[PDB]
Amino acid sequence: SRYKDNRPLNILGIDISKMELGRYNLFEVSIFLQGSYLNPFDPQEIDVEGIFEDQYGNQYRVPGFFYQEYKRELKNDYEYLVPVGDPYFKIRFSPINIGSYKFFIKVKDKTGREVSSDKYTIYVKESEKPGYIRVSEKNWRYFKFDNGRQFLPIGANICWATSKGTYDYDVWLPKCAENGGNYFRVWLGPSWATFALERESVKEYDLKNAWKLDYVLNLAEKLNMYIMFCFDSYNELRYQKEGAYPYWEHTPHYEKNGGPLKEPKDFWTNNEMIKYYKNKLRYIVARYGYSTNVFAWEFWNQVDIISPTAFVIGEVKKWHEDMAKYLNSIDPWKHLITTSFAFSPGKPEIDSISGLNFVQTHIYKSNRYIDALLSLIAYKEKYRKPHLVGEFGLDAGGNDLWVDPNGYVIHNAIWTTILSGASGTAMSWWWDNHIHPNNLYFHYRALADFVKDINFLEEKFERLTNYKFNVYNREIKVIGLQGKKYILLWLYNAKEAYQYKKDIPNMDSSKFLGSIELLIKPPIKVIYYDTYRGEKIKELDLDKNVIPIIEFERDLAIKIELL
Numbered sequence: 001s002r003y004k005d006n007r008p009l010n011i012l013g014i015d016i017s018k019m020e021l022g023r024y025n026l027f028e029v030s031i032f033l034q035g036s037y038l039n040p041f042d043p044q045e046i047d048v049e050g051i052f053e054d055q056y057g058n059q060y061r062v063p064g065f066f067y068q069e070y071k072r073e074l075k076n077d078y079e080y081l082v083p084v085g086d087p088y089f090k091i092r093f094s095p096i097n098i099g100s101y102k103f104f105i106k107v108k109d110k111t112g113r114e115v116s117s118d119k120y121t122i123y124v125k126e127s128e129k130p131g132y133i134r135v136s137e138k139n140w141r142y143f144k145f146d147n148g149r150q151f152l153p154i155g156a157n158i159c160w161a162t163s164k165g166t167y168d169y170d171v172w173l174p175k176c177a178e179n180g181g182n183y184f185r186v187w188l189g190p191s192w193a194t195f196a197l198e199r200e201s202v203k204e205y206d207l208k209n210a211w212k213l214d215y216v217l218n219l220a221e222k223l224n225m226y227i228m229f230c231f232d233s234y235n236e237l238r239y240q241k242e243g244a245y246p247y248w249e250h251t252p253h254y255e256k257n258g259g260p261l262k263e264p265k266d267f268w269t270n271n272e273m274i275k276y277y278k279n280k281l282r283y284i285v286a287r288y289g290y291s292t293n294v295f296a297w298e299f300w301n302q303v304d305i306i307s308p309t310a311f312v313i314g315e316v317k318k319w320h321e322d323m324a325k326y327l328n329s330i331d332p333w334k335h336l337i338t339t340s341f342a343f344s345p346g347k348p349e350i351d352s353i354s355g356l357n358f359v360q361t362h363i364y365k366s367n368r369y370i371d372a373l374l375s376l377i378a379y380k381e382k383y384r385k386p387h388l389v390g391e392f393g394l395d396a397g398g399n400d401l402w403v404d405p406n407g408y409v410i411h412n413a414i415w416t417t418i419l420s421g422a423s424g425t426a427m428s429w430w431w432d433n434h435i436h437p438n439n440l441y442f443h444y445r446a447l448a449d450f451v452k453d454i455n456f457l458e459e460k461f462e463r464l465t466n467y468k469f470n471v472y473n474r475e476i477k478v479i480g481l482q483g484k485k486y487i488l489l490w491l492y493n494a495k496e497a498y499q500y501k502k503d504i505p506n507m508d509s510s511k512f513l514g515s516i517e518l519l520i521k522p523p524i525k526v527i528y529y530d531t532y533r534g535e536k537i538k539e540l541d542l543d544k545n546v547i548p549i550i551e552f553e554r555d556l557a558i559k560i561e562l563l
């Protein structure tokens with residue numbers, strides 16, 4: 001209990017970040033206090049709350065959180081955080097309406113003593129921010145912002161840094177954002193993760209790693225990127241003898257390391273563990289819930305491959321139902337909630353629960369993965385909520401970087417997923433050893449420039465059918481969407497798309513290859529798009545439903561407008 005206090009409860013000072021701010025912007029309160037508590041991360045020991053009210057009756061109860069300031073520096077090849085001042089408490093709020101808000105602070109500690117502040121008034125003006133990310137009410141396959149604009153996630157996993165810490169995100173995130181990226185995913189566990197909150201303990205959270213997460217969230221704010229926060233990863237509950245990067249013997253949950261659990265199976269039902277997990281969810285909501293740049297709360301990375309001694313489907317299901325209900329109830333902004341599985345088809349008993357707002361697929365597969373992605377996307381339409389292919393790679397034991405240095409595998413996956421009805425791109429692994437050093441960001445820029453001017457929420461897209469190839473001496477296949485105004489095609493050569501040795505294609509041809517006939521009514525405008533250079537190649541006005549295919553090396557995109 002390094003942070004314990006044993007003084008009578010009193011507010012000593014309050015700092016306010018600004019009295020005028022924009023819609024959805026951060027309003028931060030710093031609270032200096034003394035009190036009686038053993039653990040500032042436990043609301044039964046000390047409970048800080050900010051009570052906000054707008055002009056329209058809406059009240060918000062925002063939990064406060066323990067905070068330490070740091071100053072970062074680079075010590076050769078590793079980040080070092082120097083503490084600045086004593087720790088204190090913060091409240092982080094974001095206004096959804098404009099106009100006036102009144103608020104005050106309430107604090108209660110374990111003695112039952114309660115103190116409060118006077119009421120303060122702030123004023124909120126309109127801003128450029130689109131709001132929080134929600135499921136689209138127009139098309140349940142897709143996400144939107146509160147203001148109605150679509151959110152199509154384009155990006156990759158960027159789940160932890162090297163020893164350089166936040167200084168790696170200083171490099172990766174601007175490169176991603178300038179190439180059309182608006183999404184990434186970070187890990188808040190296991191204990192070795194850059195942003196691990198449960199580093200030494202499951203009862204107290206790591207203030208340095210939480211500060212790094214602040215920093216990276218602030219960088220995403222500046223770059224208009226949106227983050228999935230993955231709270232826990234399967235390794236935490238997987239025994240050393242089971243392989244696959246296990247970590248149970250080292251995890252703070254284990255009694256050997258000071259935690260409440262004698263075995264990982266007890267995670268789902270141990271009363272002490274459940275209480276501390278809820279405290280962690282409260283801490284996460286308190287410290288990060290304000291942010292519209294939090295796209296989603298994700299409970300688990302691949303919960304199905306925890307130890308088989310620990311995976312009890314009914315208990316994992318009930319835990320997800322209960323925690324999703326608790327998290328939603330304490331989150332004033334009601335962020336999206338999800339979870340993930342390593343098994344590519346997922347677990348319908350869990351994917352079907354209403355408290356998970358969208359489903360995911362992880363798939364690592366080397367052979368015919370285009371067909372596998374299409375099949376999984378078609379299959380999971382049964383859930384009637386968005387589908388994110390949250391992890392994708394070859395099944396090559398991490399050897400994607402030597403097998404495919406040009407990123408053709410990533411290329412194939414992002415085009416296939418977006419044009420098959422998934423909510424956004426397939427999200428690659430290997431951000432640090434592959435995407436960045438091989439400079440693969442251009443693939444995302446080409447795709448983003450192709451899709452960004454289409455409102456997917458309103459096209460009523462469905463997977464392409466009713467088509468007829470007429471192509472000789474070549475095997476061309478199609479992934480496509482047919483909408484009320486647009487038809488989007490990705491054509492690929494089946495004999496070239498899975499070969500990765502050749503250099504990046506340089507500029508297709510002037511020649512006719514073949515044709516594809518579509519069940520559509522002319523006239524139409526046809527745009528041919530180079531998926532590697534990310535540019536229009538050719539435009540063609542047509543009076544019939546037979547679309548010529550120009551010569552191309554590996555793959556080609558076509559945008560068709562119904563006139």
Ligand SMILES: OC[C@H]1O[C@@H](O[C@H]2[C@H](O)[C@H](O)[C@H](O[C@H]3[C@H](O)[C@H](O)[C@H](O[C@H]4[C@H](O)[C@H](O)[C@H](O[C@H]5[C@H](O)[C@H](O)[C@H](O)O[C@@H]5CO)O[C@@H]4CO)O[C@@H]3CO)O[C@@H]2CO)[C@@H](O)[C@@H](O)[C@@H]1O
Nearest residue numbers: 160192233235244245301302305342343362364391398429
């Ligand atoms: O440096 C930080 C940290 O790294 C840790 O190791 C990392 C490792 O470097 C990779 O980045 C790896 O990436 C995998 C992620 O876990 C991801 O969620 C996903 O998960 C894998 C899973 O790890 C595992 O490989 C699993 O294996 C399958 C296997 O493919 C086959 O199906 C077999 O029959 O079953 C097992 C499952 O029982 O496959 C999952 C995907 O299906 O895939 C990513 C790529 O592999 O993450 C590691 C951490 O999880 C440690 O070295 C740590 O010490 C170090 O500090």
Ligand SMILES: OC[C@H]1O[C@@H](O[C@H]2[C@H](O)[C@H](O)[C@H](O)O[C@@H]2CO)[C@@H](O)[C@@H](O)[C@@H]1O
Nearest residue numbers: 077162164167168169170171172436437
């Ligand atoms: O920050 C990510 C890693 O960057 C590395 O530097 C790269 C740099 O980003 C760029 O790609 C340049 O062309 O090559 C450098 C490596 O040769 C390293 O600084 C590494 O430590 C970082 O983790």
